[PDB]
DNA sequence: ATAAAATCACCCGCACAGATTTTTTAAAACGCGCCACGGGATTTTTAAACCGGTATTTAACGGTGTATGAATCCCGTTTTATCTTCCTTTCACTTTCTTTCTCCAGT
């Protein structure tokens, strides 16, 4: 952490494709993102395919 | 000094609706000119009124069976009369800045 007295995970070991099913939206310097949500069953079927 | 409840400015990308701002275009206008058109004075011809008569074609009249016009009752629409308001304006007051007049200690 900032004081060097704790530990924080670098990334989560997720079982869910969260990015596609929930989307995202943010504004940065020189760029931006905009992603719509989706349906979980269709994403799972696509991953299996 | 402990409790209860509230409010606002800016940064970073991107897409779009709305508000100016040039730019182009069609209508209105002006000056000059010429010839198409209408006025005036003869020739010509034909549309309609007038006499017949005849042969149809219409309107006024007497029964039935409706469709609608005036009256009543409402509710959205638009006018008109009637309140409050923010900028213009001065203006007497207040405040604040600039120059001047002394004091005055020192030598």
Swiss-Prot record:
Transmembrane segments: none
Compartments where located: Cytoplasm
Functional note: A type II topoisomerase that negatively supercoils closed circular double-stranded (ds) DNA in an ATP-dependent manner to maintain chromosomes in an underwound state. This makes better substrates for topoisomerase IV (ParC and ParE) which is the main enzyme that unlinks newly replicated chromosomes in E.coli. Gyrase catalyzes the interconversion of other topological isomers of dsDNA rings, including catenanes. Relaxes negatively supercoiled DNA in an ATP-independent manner.
Misc. remarks from the entry: When the enzyme transiently cleaves DNA a phosphotyrosine bond is formed between GyrA and DNA. In the presence of quinolones this intermediate can be trapped and is used as an indicator of drug toxicity. The enzyme-DNA intermediate is also the target of a number of topoisomerase poisons, including toxin CcdB.
Domain notes: An N-terminal fragment (residues 1-523) can be reconstituted with GyrB, but the complex no longer has negative supercoiling or ATP-independent DNA relaxation activities, although it is capable of DNA cleavage; ATP-dependent relaxation is inhibited by novobiocin and non-hydrolyzable ATP analogs. The fragment has ATP-dependent DNA relaxation and 30-fold improved decatenation activities, unlike holoenzyme it preferentially binds supercoiled DNA. The C-terminal domain (CTD, approximately residues 535-841) contains 6 tandemly repeated subdomains known as blades, each of which is composed of a 4-stranded antiparallel beta-sheet. The blades form a circular-shaped beta-pinwheel fold arranged in a spiral around a screw axis, to which DNA probably binds, inducing strong positive superhelicity (about 0.8 links/protein).
Family membership noted in the UniProt record: Belongs to the type II topoisomerase GyrA/ParC subunit family.
Record's subunit section: Heterotetramer, composed of two GyrA and two GyrB chains. In the heterotetramer, GyrA contains the active site tyrosine that forms a transient covalent intermediate with the DNA, while GyrB binds cofactors and catalyzes ATP hydrolysis. Can form a 2:2 complex with toxin CcdB in which GyrA is inactive; rejuvenation of GyrA(2)CcdB(2) is effected by CcdA.
Record-given protein name: DNA gyrase subunit A
Residues of the whole record sequence present: 148 to 196 of 875
């Amino acid at each position: 952490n900032y004081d060097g007295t704790e530990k924080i995970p670098d990334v989560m070991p997720t079982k869910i494709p969260n990015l596609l099913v929930n989307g995202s939206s943010g504004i940065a310097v020189g760029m931006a993102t905009n992603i719509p949500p989706h349906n979980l069953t269709e994403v799972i079927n696509g991953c299996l395919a």
